[PDB]
Amino acid sequence: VQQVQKKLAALEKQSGGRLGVALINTADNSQVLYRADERFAMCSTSKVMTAAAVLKQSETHDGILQQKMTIKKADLTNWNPVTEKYVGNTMTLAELSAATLQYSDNTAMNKLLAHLGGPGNVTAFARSIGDTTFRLDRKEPELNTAIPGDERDTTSPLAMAKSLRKLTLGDALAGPQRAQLVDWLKGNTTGGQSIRAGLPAHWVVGDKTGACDYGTTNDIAVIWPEDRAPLVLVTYFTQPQQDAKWRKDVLAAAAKIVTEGK
Ligand SMILES: *C(=O)[C@H]([C@@H](C)O)[C@H]1CC(SCCNC=N)=C(C(=O)O)N1
């Protein structure tokens, strides 16, 4: 453990940024923490809490995931990998949730936010599940500024690890909703060079990445090591320069360091 600690600290010092790690081993509830209580900009990883809020509604509102929303050229933002393929057409909340989680579509994120009534409702949802750290303040793309010292749109590695666990393995969501979130996370197409890169290839993973200003490179995941109890891992990383380049490789190394031998 203290060896895992020295390695993480060395990884951070060599990277020149600020690293935040929180790993929860559901086998014995043990934890590997590094700046786990410090706040980091979540940017794209905040889409998990947001999608989960929509899923929560579906527990009481029958067929809500089949409800349609119109996509218009005016809704488009700086990143619409999927939504731009539907200009002038409709997308269901499920499709929007999938586009948001698996391709990190910014316009889909804003569609979900509009449906939920704004980011304050996502924050409220987080509080309803016991997360008092999480906070969503803005919409896309402003929530990605990741300004140092700014608390807007941030959370701690540990708090996000606990909520991801509650949402994917716990009781924060009901069975069908819990299963849909896990499926969406496993279908993510943007995490190939992050947490997944530092893990044995056959291990099963569900995750949500994030890449924003100040070279902030994030990733939150649920890991199933073969037939052993799943691990919940959060690797957050931010740098001194506003225009810094992303370090998906730092998250891969943090991942390997804390999960090796698990
Ligand atoms: C989330 O933090 C941002 C924001 C614009 O919504 C998006 C952008 C990306 S693509 C980053 C790196 N890909 C290729 N070079 C992601 C993402 O999931 O990676 N989130």
Automatic annotation (TrEMBL):
Domain Beta-lactamase class A catalytic: 21-235
Keyword Ribonucleoprotein: no
BP GO terms, sorted: beta-lactam antibiotic catabolic process; response to antibiotic
Keywords: Antibiotic resistance, Hydrolase, Signal
Primary enzyme class: hydrolase
E.C. numbers: 3.5.2.6
Reaction it catalyzes: a beta-lactam + H2O = a substituted beta-amino acid
GO molecular function term, any single one: beta-lactamase activity
Pfam families from the UniProt entry: Beta-lactamase2
Similarity comment text for this entry: Belongs to the class-A beta-lactamase family.
Protein's name according to its UniProt entry: Beta-lactamase
Organism from which the protein derives: Citrobacter sedlakii
